Symmetry: C2
Subunit: 298 residues, 2 copies
Amino acid sequence: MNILLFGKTGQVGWELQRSLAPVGNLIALDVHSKEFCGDFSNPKGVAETVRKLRPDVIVNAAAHTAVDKAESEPELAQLLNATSVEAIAKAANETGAWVVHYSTDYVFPGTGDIPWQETDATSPLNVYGKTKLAGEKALQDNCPKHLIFRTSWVYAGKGNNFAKTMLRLAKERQTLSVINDQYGAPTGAELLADCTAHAIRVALNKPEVAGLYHLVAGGTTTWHDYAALVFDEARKAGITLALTELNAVPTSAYPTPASRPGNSRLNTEKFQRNFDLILPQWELGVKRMLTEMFTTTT
Amino acid sequence: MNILLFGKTGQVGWELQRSLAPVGNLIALDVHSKEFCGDFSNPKGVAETVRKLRPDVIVNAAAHTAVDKAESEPELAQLLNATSVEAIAKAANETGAWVVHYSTDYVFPGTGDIPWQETDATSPLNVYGKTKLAGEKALQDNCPKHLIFRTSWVYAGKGNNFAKTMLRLAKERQTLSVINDQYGAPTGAELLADCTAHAIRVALNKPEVAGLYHLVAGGTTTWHDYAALVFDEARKAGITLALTELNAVPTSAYPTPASRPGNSRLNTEKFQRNFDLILPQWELGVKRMLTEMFTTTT
Ligand SMILES: [Mg+2]
């Protein structure tokens, strides 16, 4: 089988370059692909690239992911999260290709306690969540062979992440201010990429599994408890932290243009039973990525 | 499904901790496991641990892997590569568990040009290759639900590897001496771990796939051409190298106690058709691990 991956240098993309490699012949693109077009600002471009290669499977890990930035540029966000997705869907549905696509919990509003299911209604609180919804509906309406994985709080050890940004603060600052009222499960690019690889191989043999899935590491936490785990782990690894007091705070006190939900929790029972896969507790992934970060030599 | 992984902190083990995580409930052990025994010097210990947990799948990534050291300590090598493998096989075959086990091209002699198949005769040139053979025969004779993956020239980005060791030399030294007559395909722990995850899920639904497989990245190279690629890549990343002349050399000129083969090439058609998987060219894996090594920030 031939597989076409867009967004190869993103967090999830970099891990997909790895996970998809034994699944089939991988062509990995991004915006700077010279010999092929991987720029989602050119929907007809990405559409065309899809016709030029005829993949059995298209994995889209490209997206406009700057939530706040999206509010100011909802046209550019629409083009990346919706238009190009529709374009690639229509083109995919020509050869009967599968399309794997990543989406978000920002598709939902906010109601603490309750984890959202795929059978829940959607009302996006911000542009990013809105344009992503438009993309999944566009995929849903143009291509029956689809897998939509809604995820949240994504991190990877390659490049910038919450842990890193927070660790930079804990090295240089004395006291820190971090939210304790937004709830979710940090989900590793490792987990996303590997689940994707298994899900593809199920799908090719059981097309009935097509549809919408919630896909996140198990458990639930807040940015504050997430950060306390990062600091705890960094202390156990011999990283000294200027930080001596960790303070919890409400969301509102500090500006974010785009409304971020307080309840990002997702129920993932659907994914678990249809692919026969396990979704490990969120900490495992984060601890592993922290160990990799702290065990660098040269 | 429950999965039991021994050797979790080795090169392949560390990647298996990741790849096996969504496949089933993972219990990952190594020698220093306190609350469970993962020490292959205690064959009855590892046997017992296997009875205590009753896994559906046992993945053994533990082994005595110091080739030269093995010659001097063939008793310790025998205990780790053979005895404990037999012990875990017998214990596995009690509950009908699968056993995944890693082996080596050191099982074969040396005859340039020709890639070895699973239907080839074996005559191990050294103790490591000899004790590993004894382990695969012991697994083969005690446990019908087995997957043996013979691999070679294994590297990972976590911890020490050929690339790293060679890069350390190219930073500090002016001229280098490296073999150009031993042939094989460097195989990433990423590839081994991911193929293992897919192979397990095939095996559980088609037990007919049980058996011996050759499993290595595609293509073929020598340590010299491997090193020239590492240096080439390091030059393209802005790593300055004291090195200005790269010289090829025969194996013999410099001591290795244990005989290393000149022909480590392996034919992997068997694995490819039975699992419906791709085994990408060796360079891809190495370039990726080099990029990860060179793109470290803090
Ligand atoms: Mg990795």
